[PDB]
Amino acid sequence: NKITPNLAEFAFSLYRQLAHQSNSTNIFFSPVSIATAFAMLSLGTKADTHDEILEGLNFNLTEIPEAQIHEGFQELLRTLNQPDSQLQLTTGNGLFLSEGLKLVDKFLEDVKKLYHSEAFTVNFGDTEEAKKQINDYVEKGTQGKIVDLVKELDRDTVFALVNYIFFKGKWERPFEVKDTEEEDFHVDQVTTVKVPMMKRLGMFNIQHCKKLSSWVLLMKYLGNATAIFFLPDEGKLQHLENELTHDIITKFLENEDRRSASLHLPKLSITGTYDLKSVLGQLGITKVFSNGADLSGVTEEAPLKLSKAVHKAVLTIDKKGCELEAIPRSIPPEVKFNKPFVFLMIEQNTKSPLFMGKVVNPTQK
Numbered sequence: 148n149k150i151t152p153n154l155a156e157f158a159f160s161l162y163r164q165l166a167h168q169s170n171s172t173n174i175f176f177s178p179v180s181i182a183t184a185f186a187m188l189s190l191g192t193k194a195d196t197h198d199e200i201l202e203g204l205n206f207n208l209t210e211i212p213e214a215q216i217h218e219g220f221q222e223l224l225r226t227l228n229q230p231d232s233q234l235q236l237t238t239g240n241g242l243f244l245s246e247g248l249k250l251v252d253k254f255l256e257d258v259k260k261l262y263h264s265e266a267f268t269v270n271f272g273d274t275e276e277a278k279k280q281i282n283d284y285v286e287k288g289t290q291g292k293i294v295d296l297v298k299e300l301d302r303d304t305v306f307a308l309v310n311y312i313f314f315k316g317k318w319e320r321p322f323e324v325k326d327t328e329e330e331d332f333h334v335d336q337v338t339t340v341k342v343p344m345m346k347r348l349g350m351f352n353i354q355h356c357k358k359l360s361s362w363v364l365l366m367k368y369l370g371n372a373t374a375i376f377f378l379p380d381e382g383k384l385q386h387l388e389n390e391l392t393h394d395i396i397t398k399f400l401e402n403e404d405r406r407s408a409s410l411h412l413p414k415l416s417i418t419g420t421y422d423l424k425s426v427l428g429q430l431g432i433t434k435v436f437s438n439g440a441d442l443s444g445v446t447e448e449a450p451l452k453l454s455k456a457v458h459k460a461v462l463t464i465d466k467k468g469c470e471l472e473a474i475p476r477s478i479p480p481e482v483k484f485n486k487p488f489v490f491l492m493i494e495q496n497t498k499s500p501l502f503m504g505k506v507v508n509p510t511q512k
């Protein structure tokens with residue numbers, strides 16, 4: 148898979164964009180799903196609008212042809228959405244065009260075939276009816292998990308994109324529920340948050356990085372996925388966020404050997420909701436949202452723009468896992484994730500970052 152380093156660098160630029168905006172808010176998104184969403188949308192666009200999207204998704208058009216990109220994305224969607232997939236995630240993309248627009252079939256069918264997404268037709272004249280139709284589709288798609296995603300629609304909304312993703316993975320090495328107890332999470336020097344802290348003594352692929360000045364924990368999910376947590380040292384979060392590059396992450400993933408440790412990891416449920424129009428606008432994706440948008444591939448009768456693009460990622464880190472291990476005699480280091488930390492979810496075989504985020508406060512819904 149040759150598109151991974153682009154998704155990786157797209158993830159970091161998208162992350163640092165959000166980290167630059169807010170200092171003390173939870174960051175959590177899926178750069179794979181977001182990229183997929185707009186890689187799929189790239190079929191409907193043409194000319195400069197088409198070029199602006201991919202280049203904004205961190206793809207040099209000359210270095211990697213679009214024909215090769217789209218199948219590269221399809222290979223991920225194939226890997227994620229499998230039969231008997233123990234990843235246990237429900238990602239899905241929903242297009243919502245206004246009834247009356249004569250839609251191009253070429254686009255619609257490639258949305259279903261190449262990207263396994265699904266487009267719908269809705270009456271945007273009725274705002275509340277549309278809002279419900281969007282959120283019910285998401286509620287349907289996420290098995291009732293994500294609800295009331297779209298809080299508002301514009302009066303002249305013509306084409307709305309919505310990209311949800313839920314993930315409740317199980318660890319290869321579970322934490323004990325009895326061990327989990329209430330502990331303080333130091334969000335900053337003043338704010339302190341009581342959180343259910345999971346904790347297990349055992350062998351973890353955990354190493355204190357000197358390059359990042361951070362404790363770097365790696366935990367294998369059940370099924371082909373891995374969770375990399377980065378716990379920065381005292382006042383090194385800024386340093387950490389800057390120093391992270393795909394070359395560095397891969398350098399940790401390929402490290403296998405473990406170390407005995409007394410880990411404190413917070414049980415949490417974080418949701419990141421993002422107006423992609425606003426967020427990707429900062430990264431460079433702007434013309435598709437503008438009036439002069441080349442969406443002739445979607446519909447060629449009337450002019451069109453992507454009037455709304457929303458994304459909501461939901462994570463559930465909890466103690467549950469699968470159904471031996473020997474610990475050395477030495478005193479294990481007590482690595483506590485009680486202060487804000489960055490983390491990624493990487494798909495094992497493609498090495499693509501499903502999720503990325505920073506926990507500022509676990510109780511922040």
Ligand SMILES: *[C@@H]1O[C@H](CO)[C@@H](O)[C@H](O)[C@H]1NC(C)=O
Pocket residue numbers: 370371495
């Ligand atoms: C990853 O999944 C493949 C099948 O999709 C399996 O053969 C392999 O053992 C898995 N590897 C790990 C490390 O989970």
